[PDB]
């Protein structure tokens, strides 16, 4: 079971297979999966409930398979695909803005996010 939730909307509060990107690389959870906490790395996420597959872009968060087999996914906001080239161009502008030093780090996260998005 999945319990994908945000302080914005409750997405997927059984959701058979969920594929997640975690700081442990990528983790997939299926039915009964062992109860873990994983910090979710900012992500391209696939959620499958039966055969149907839905494609979240997720702001990073926490994942917790609970021992009651509830995959509590908590993230600020998240499918990503409807949002989608000017964002890559302005992201190049933010990369040039990485010349300016926390602001560099912010802009770097922005560059990471563009790469992650651009893959889909």
């Amino acid at each position: 079971k999945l319990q994908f939730a945000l302080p914005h909307e409750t997405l997927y509060s059984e959701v058979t297979q969920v594929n997640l990107p975690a700081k442990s690389g990528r983790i997939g959870v299926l039915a009964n999966h062992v109860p873990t906490v994983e910090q979710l790395l900012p992500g391209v996420v696939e959620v499958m409930e039966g055969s149907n597959s839905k494609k979240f872009f997720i702001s990073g968060g926490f994942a917790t398979v609970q021992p009651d087999s509830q995959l509590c996914v908590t993230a600020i906001e998240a499918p990503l695909e409807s949002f989608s080239e000017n964002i890559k161009n302005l992201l190049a502008e933010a990369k040039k803005n990485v010349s300016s030093s926390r602001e560099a780090a912010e802009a770097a996260i922005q560059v990471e996010v563009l790469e992650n998005l651009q893959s889909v």
């Binding site: 700081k23 442990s24 062992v34 109860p35 873990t36 906490v37 994983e38 910090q39 917790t64 021992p67």
Partner: peptide, 9 residues
């Protein structure tokens, strides 16, 4: 430990 996670991260 029933929320297993590594030292790293």
């Amino acid at each position: 430990g029933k929320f297993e996670i590594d030292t790293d991260a």
